[PDB]
Structure formats: C-alpha cells, structure tokens
A paper describes a structure:
The [name]-[name] complex crystallized in two forms with identical heterotetramers consisting of an [name] dimer and two [name] molecules. [name] has a compact two-layered α/β-sandwich structure with a central four-stranded mixed β-sheet having the connectivity β1↑β2↑β4↓β3↑ and two α-helices. [name] interacts with the large domain of one [name] subunit within the dimer, with the exception of the tip of the loop containing the essential Cys328 of [name], which comes from the other subunit. This persulfide-carrying Cys328IscS is juxtaposed against the acceptor cysteine of [name], Cys19TusA, with only ∼4 Å separating their S atoms. Most of the [name] residues involved in the interaction with [name] are located on the outside face of a six-turn helix α2, the N-terminus of strand β2, the C-terminus of the neighbouring strand β9, and the following loop β9/α7. The residues of [name] contacting [name] are located on two α-helices (α1TusA and α2TusA), which are nearly perpendicular to helix α2IscS. Formation of the complex buries the α-helical layer of [name] and leaves its β-sheet layer exposed to the solvent. Approximately 710 Å2 of the molecular surface of each binding partner is buried, corresponding to ∼16% of the total [name] surface area. The main van der Waals contacts are provided by [name] Met24TusA, Met25TusA (α1TusA), Phe55TusA, Phe58TusA, Met59TusA (α2TusA) and [name] Trp45IscS (stacking with Phe58TusA), and the aliphatic portions of Arg55IscS and Arg237IscS. The conformation of the Cys328IscS loop in the [name]-[name] complex, with the donor and acceptor cysteines in close proximity, suggests that the observed conformation is close to that expected in a transfer-competent state.
The [name] [name] is a highly conserved master enzyme initiating sulfur transfer via persulfide to a range of acceptor proteins involved in Fe-S cluster assembly, [name] modifications, and sulfur-containing cofactor biosynthesis. [name] is a highly conserved, widely distributed pyridoxal-5′-phosphate (PLP)-dependent enzyme, with 60% sequence identity between the enzyme from [name] and its human homolog, NFS1. It initiates intracellular sulfur trafficking, delivering the sulfur to several sulfur-accepting proteins such as IscU, ThiI, [name], and MoaD/MoeB that commit the sulfur to different metabolic pathways, including iron-sulfur cluster assembly, thiamine and biotin synthesis, [name] modifications, or molybdopterin biosynthesis. The small domain (residues 1–15 and 264–404) contains the critical active site cysteine Cys328.
Residue numbers in the entry:
A (entry chain A): 1 to 326, 333 to 390
B (entry chain B): 1 to 328, 333 to 392
C (entry chain C), D (entry chain D): 4 to 80
Write the structure that this text describes.
Amino acid sequence: MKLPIYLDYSATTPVDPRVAEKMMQFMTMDGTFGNPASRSHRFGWQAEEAVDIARNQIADLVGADPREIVFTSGATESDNLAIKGAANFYQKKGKHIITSKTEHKAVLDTCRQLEREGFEVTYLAPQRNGIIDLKELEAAMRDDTILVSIMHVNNEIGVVQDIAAIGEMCRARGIIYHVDATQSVGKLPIDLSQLKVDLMSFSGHKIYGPKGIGALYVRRKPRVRIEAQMHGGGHERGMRSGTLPVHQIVGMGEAYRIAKEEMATEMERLRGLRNRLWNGIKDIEEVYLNGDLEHGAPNILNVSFNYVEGESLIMALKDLAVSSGSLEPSYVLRALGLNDELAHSSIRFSLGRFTTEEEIDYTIELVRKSIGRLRDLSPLWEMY
Amino acid sequence: MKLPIYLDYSATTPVDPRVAEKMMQFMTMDGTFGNPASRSHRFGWQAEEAVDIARNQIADLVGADPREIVFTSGATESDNLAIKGAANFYQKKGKHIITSKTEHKAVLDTCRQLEREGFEVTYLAPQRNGIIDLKELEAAMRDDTILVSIMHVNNEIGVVQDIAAIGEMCRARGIIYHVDATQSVGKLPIDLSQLKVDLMSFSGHKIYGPKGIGALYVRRKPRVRIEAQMHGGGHERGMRSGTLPVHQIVGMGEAYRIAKEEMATEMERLRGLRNRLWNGIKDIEEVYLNGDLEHGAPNILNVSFNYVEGESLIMALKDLAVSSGSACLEPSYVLRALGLNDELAHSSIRFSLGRFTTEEEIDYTIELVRKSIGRLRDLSPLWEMYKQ
Amino acid sequence: LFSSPDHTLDALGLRCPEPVMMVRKTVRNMQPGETLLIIADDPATTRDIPGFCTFMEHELVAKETDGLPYRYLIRKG
Amino acid sequence: LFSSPDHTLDALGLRCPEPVMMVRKTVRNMQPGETLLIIADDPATTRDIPGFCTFMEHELVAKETDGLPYRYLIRKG
Ligand SMILES: *Cc1c(COP(=O)(O)O)cnc(C)c1O
Ligand SMILES: *Cc1c(COP(=O)(O)O)cnc(C)c1O
C-alpha cells in the first residue's frame, strides 16, 4: 500500500469519487449553477429540484420526512442550532439542560454559552466504559428540565449510547431530546419514525461527503420547534436563512444515498477489520481498550499504551495517520478516569471505506515492535 | 448565444473554471482531503497551508491582514456574526444600532432579532436615488450608539454608499462600523488599511466562487472584538468554530485572486456594457432608472417600466434570466423604500451583468425590451389610459 | 375532469414551501403520464403549482382556485 | 548563529495560531535557502515552529527556548 496509512476517518473522510463527480455538475456555467431562490427563471427552479432530491436522500437514510431536514454548514452549526434553538424556544417551561461530559465541543461549548446566558446545565460523568448511567440521568431530570443532549456514537472512543431508551425517558417527561449523530450516521441504523428523538445532527465529511455542509433533523410529529440562529429571509422554513449551496447539498445527498446502500456490508467488513486489529494487539502486556468492544462503533478502536512516553509514541507510529485526541490530553479520556500520562499515550484508530486487511496487518506489526522498542528505551518501563 | 440569456449575476454567478479546477484537488483520496485541525499528521498540516494561501489571497484583495479574516459559511452568516457579535460585546457602552431600510435581509432580519433581545435599532430611509443622507445618519447617532451597518453596493439597485465618509463619522465617535461588501467585492476597489471600517462581510458566489463559503473582516488595529455566534473548539481565533471546508476556502481564495487581477479591465468592460444597455432603452417613453448611473456599480441596472402589468413583463422577457426583487406576492422592499408604488415596483427589472456577458447579448436584450414593452402597452388598458 | 386521478395528495394545512416540496417528491415516484390530484389551501399554490409545471416541464391539466380548498390536476411530463 | 539572518520577524505578543500564520506567509515570499529570525513569547511556538519544519519540509537551524523571548532560525527548504 501507500504511506502513511490513513487511520483517522473519524477526523474526516475522503470525498467519494461518485460524490465528487455529482458535485462537479452543479458549479460552472454549463452546469446547474443557479440559485435555488431565484423563482423567476429555470436556473433557480432546477437547482431547487436537485436540492429536493438530496434532501430526500438524506431523509431516507434516517427514516425521516424531507420537511424535517434543515440544511446547515455542518454538524457544529447543527449542534448550535438544535441546542440554542430549543433552549430559547422552550425557556418559559424552564431553563435547565442536561448533557454529557464526553460530548463533542460543539455541544459542550454551546451549553457553556447558554450558562453565560442564564441557563443551568448538568454535565454528567460517564461510566468507565464511556456509557452514561440512565439512573444518574433520571436523577438529574427536574420539572424545569427542558432539554437533554446525548450523542449516539462517541467520536473519540466510539462508545454507543442507548438513545432509544433516553428518548423514551425524555418524551415521557416532555423533555426535548437532541442527538449528535455525526459519527453514527451511515454506520449504525437510524429510524426516526421509531426513535423518540426530537433533534438530530449529522454532517457530510464523516461519511465521504464534502466538508462545509450538514443538516439538522427537526421532528414534525409530535411537532418540535426551535428559534433560528441565522437570520435573513427565513429560508429553510424559517429555521436557517442563507443561500443554499447546491453543489455541497448534492454531494451530501449522494453520500447519504451510497451510505444507505452499502451500509450493511461495509459495517460488517469494518468491525471485522476492527476485531482483527484488536486481536493482534490485545496480548501486548499493558494495553487498555477505551470504550466497549461489543457495543462500540464498528469503525473505532481507542487503545491506551502503558509505560511509554506519549510524545514518542506518535512518532514511532509515523507510518500511520492517527489521532491521540490531544500539550493538553483528551478531555474524553480524562473524563473516563485516565491519568494524564496514560491519556497522552492513547491512540485512536478509526477505519473506513479504503482500509484493507493488508493495512491492518501492517498496523498490528508496527504497533507490536514499536511498543516493544519504546519500552526498551523507557526508564518508565524499566521500573515496571 | 444560448437561451435563456443570464442577466442575474447579482443573485449568483457561475463558478469560474479555474476556481472549480482548484477545488477538485482538495476533495478525494488522491487529493488534499485532510482536516486542517489534524495537527498529528501531514494530511492536516498541508490542508492548513492551502487554507493560509486562500486566506492571504482574500486579504490581499481588500488590503487587510490575514489575521483579520474570519471564515464563515457565507455573507448571511458574516452579517449575523458581525452585527450580533459586536452588539453583544459592546452592550455595556450602549444598545442603540443604526442601519438602512435598503440593506439585505441578512442585516435587517438580524437587527429585528436584536430588537426582541432588548436592542433599539434605527432604520434610516434612503433618498430616492438610493443614497443615504449622512446628516440624517448623524442626527440618529447618540451617546449609546454602539454600531452602524451600511452596505457598500446595494444588491437590487446597485447604488454605492460613501463608506469612507461613514467610517470617518463612526471612528470619530467610537462607533463600530460594519459594511456589507458582498456586492462590491472584486467590483469596486477596497483598501481596509485606508478605510475606517471595523467589520466587513464578503462571499464567494457573487464573484465566481462557490456558494456556501464567505468571510468576515475583523479589524486588528484599532482592535475590534466580537462575541462568537458559533461555539465548539474556538476555531478562527475563537470567533467562528467548526471544521474548515478546505475545497470551499481554496475556491474562494482562487476567486479573490482572479478578481484582484482582472478587476480593472473587467469593470470597465461591464461599465461599458451597462451604459450600452441603458442608452438602448432610455428613450422608451415611460421608463425610469432606479439608482444612480454615475455612482452606481458597473454591473447593475434597475429599470422601472410604467403603464405595463408587471406579471406579464417577466413573461414577455422570458428569453432573459433576470429578477424583479419580488418576494416569495408583494414587490421589492428596496423599491418601495425608494418610493415606487406597488404597481411600478412590480414592473421593474434588475439587469445584472457578469464576465460572460457579451455585446451580442446586450443588443439582443435592447431589442427584446423595446419590442416587448411596445407589445404589452398595446394590449394594456393601463397604457390606453396614459395616451388618453 | 377530477374524476380519474391515478394518485392523490392531501396538502391541506401545508404552507409554502411545503406544498411544492411534497409535489416534487410525489411526482418523482410517479410514471410519466400518470396524474396527481393535489388538494391545498395555501394561497401561494395558485402561483407555485403552475410555476412548477412551467419551469419543470410538466402539464397542468386543470386547476380550481375560486374557493377552498383548491384543486390541481397534474400529469407527469 | 543568529548573526546572519536574511529576514526578521517580530512575533512578540502573538498567540497560537497567529505566530505560525505569520511564519507561513513570511516563508512564502522567501527564496529557497534564505533564513528567518523569529522572535516570539508564545509558549506554543516551542512545539509549533519545529512542527512547521517537520511537516512542511523545512529546516530548523537553531532554537532558543530557555527564556523570553524565544528565538528560532529557520532556513527555507
Ligand atoms: C466531526 C464531529 C462534529 C463536527 O462536524 P462538522 O461538520 O465538522 O462541524 C460534531 N460532532 C461529532 C461527534 C463529530 O465527530
Ligand atoms: C447575496 C448577498 C448576501 C448573502 O450572501 P450569501 O453568501 O448567499 O449568504 C448578503 N448581502 C448582500 C448585499 C448580498 O448581495
């Protein structure tokens, strides 16, 4: 294969060639470059048709109605829109919000802004395996609790939350439930016609779509409402104003179409490679799996390596393009209870559509002799 | 030529072939598809380099420093960011904002949102050539005035505001000045090292870049600060969080580079084509120029046709891809701000030119307008009334 | 003339841009030549639906806009 | 070792990601082989500047980080 080997699909993925060649047809003069807001001519009407096709492809993946799909600039905005939008709309019912310590920054920082605006937020600590204890969640809920935000798949450790149960808990108490599904979309099955989720965020560049585009699911029945954060013409049915980037939208739709198609087979292959990689390193003396092997995403493997200096670990695996989630170490691992040194020598392996058996075996061997020769030079390992 | 003829560059422009050529290199596996935030490997570091190049290309166009450039999802966001960001940061000094009734929705709607948040906003009526009277602007300013937002070039009638003068008025009183330059960028010369503008918004798809990308200039000296409206990691120096769309940013940068280069020549050519169009229809009996021919953008021509039913006008000129500014129903809020009655505003056409516009297309347009207005006025009971 | 529609679409209660959104999706899952009865009460549909026909190459068979609810017979081009 | 720099760069007062932003730009209008003296007091530069050299294929001639201000001599590769 080629070097370095890309094992950072969770940071972003390459745009699928099929997705890319679709986008190319909605940019230049002899393409559908029109503005989907120009109602007086066909350049705009045809651009709107492409937008609608992509809107339905996105909806079909998550089992929603196209009218529930609101286009954003990405998952960051979607998380901001959902949380701030619901928090502001339902503040007359209360101002208390519940979330998790291991949520993506888009969620955590949004909640922090809301605290500065008078809202009260509870950040729940997860279990050692990353799972939220639903009884601790229940104990946090109150009369004035209006909103809960807990992600489907964790982007660092890949742990899967029980969003169905959480939805049941929320709906029963009239609490709005938001789910950040940026990592789960196109990986774990999602059906909003069954799920009791009110708001759900997803992106494009995590499932081989382009960066700079995303969407927000807003439940139509029972009707959920939000206050727009982006003003200027009341586009997206009053929920997100601005020109619709057709080429981006088309790319995201096409990506969601392909996902629905190759989902079952691809995720089998992924967790197959995922188990192949863990089996190949699990017998190294002092390594630790962060998350859950049996109910984690099929594409993420977060492993901690003991008695090795973190800085040098990332250099020893120079042949791999991975992530440590880091001067300061991952706030997610810190939340799990990892001491700062252990968190620094933790590697997040994320697999994808181009990952092969060959690359995994090469990775397994690289890890074996890297950890071995690092612990040789390690005064740290000598004391162990 | 081909049909229909595209004369709606103000709504959006086609992506330049060179621009799309560059964008396609930052997408797939064999390109630079990396995340500019991945500091642990090369995929991230070289995507970040491309972002920097495009960031300097954008800054060089408007005579700013790259550190003053904040990437957004478009001009709408930039307008929201600037206005809400400044209003919130400087609210201890006052809660009064001033703007124009002819501003783009992104500015107007953002202001109404701040109004329901406790802010007080003054919407100034323009003179009927579109120009804001600076004396009425000054009369609106107060102790508690923290922010003024007045656009460079109007997107519907193309009128140019004296942003330098407005900047002087603002800086002298310690008032933040925001300019929406979405329509003026790459069309009128801009130098922030001279201009007294604190915040300026621009886009990509108005200047042959791709939709879904934009930027907000935030003045570095004298330092101007704003509250971020998008949270999640404090990217863009804490002013706008979220992943950086490399291919988009590269496209906008390449477009701004091309702009700086072909600006002087292209604008003279468009100014010529614009004058060619007006001179070919100005002698029609009851037509009216909406704006200012001598200090209006070189690319926009808004004309009113009297004593014809507006609905049929758009249908008669179906060979042309234009705009009336109508909303959805009712007519352009910019035109009725100028004072046009609903009927006249309905029968107004905004011709906007671009770098694909030919003399051949303009002469076709001239003939079509002459022929169509004459044809409609014959069937028009309204016109019969005028002839008496 | 509204007697033999192949498909029906209850768009009552829907407001722009929803009516046309539903029309777009329904017309896409239709065979070329089939008909769709559209029932709506959004005043904008008097403009939007014929516009959908003009700019999207479809045929507007018959409309009813002189009272509520409106009725539009569309034949997929 | 710091005596013969072709170009200088006062990055004092700058904070990540600014210092590296200014380095990218300055290195861009530099001839391959010329040297740049970077003065900085941003702690992050101790990591970021050699990182700029590693991932951008440039050569770090000499660093000085035992106090303020820091000093980095790079040679355009
Ligand atoms: C990547 C990611 C986001 C951010 O998505 P963007 O479109 O890049 O802003 C949010 N949440 C999770 C879990 C993510 O993995
Ligand atoms: C088009 C336009 C905008 C909006 O630009 P987007 O990038 O599409 O959001 C804002 N202001 C003016 C004057 C415009 O012409």
